[PDB]
Ligand binder design. Sequence first.
Ligand code: SF4
Lengths: 73, 107
Amino acid sequence: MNVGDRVRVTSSVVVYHHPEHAKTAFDLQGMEGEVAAVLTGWQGRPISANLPVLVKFEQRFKAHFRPDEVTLI
Amino acid sequence: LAAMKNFAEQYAKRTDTYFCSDLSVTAVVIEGLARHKEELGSPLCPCRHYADKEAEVKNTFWNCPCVPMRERKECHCMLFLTPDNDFAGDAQGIPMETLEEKKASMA
Ligand code: SF4
């Protein structure tokens, strides 16, 4: 996986922070975005984020995923 | 400790989530969050093992409310539970006394 890679949400992922569905369960499955970050460490110091893949979508919306929930496009 | 108590109660109501049926569980996590905020400055999740607690704090992924909870309403600690969860009680508040009892018995 690389920062900048385009990906499609293949697994079902229900979120509540989407700008057009605030506080409401919304499945991201099928949406496509760009990888903005892969959380592993902060200033060389290893972090333990269990949803390391940060994906940015349109509408100023971003969300975190496991490597297995998205597919390289 | 009191600020952490208020935080949990308000967030629980804000997200329509509930505390564990057994408030002692809730108490332990709140006390742990309070503890971490003192030593680290941030409410780092206390129910996990970190290699660099200070780095984790700077990244913020695990600062309560964590990314999984803010995005997926997922709290592996069992602090904020969805209504359908078997361990979810109907309370969104916890007596201050309950917490005090935890400070009393730690070990
Ligand atoms: S799992 Fe997340 S929401 Fe639950 S106590 Fe830990 S940091 Fe807070």
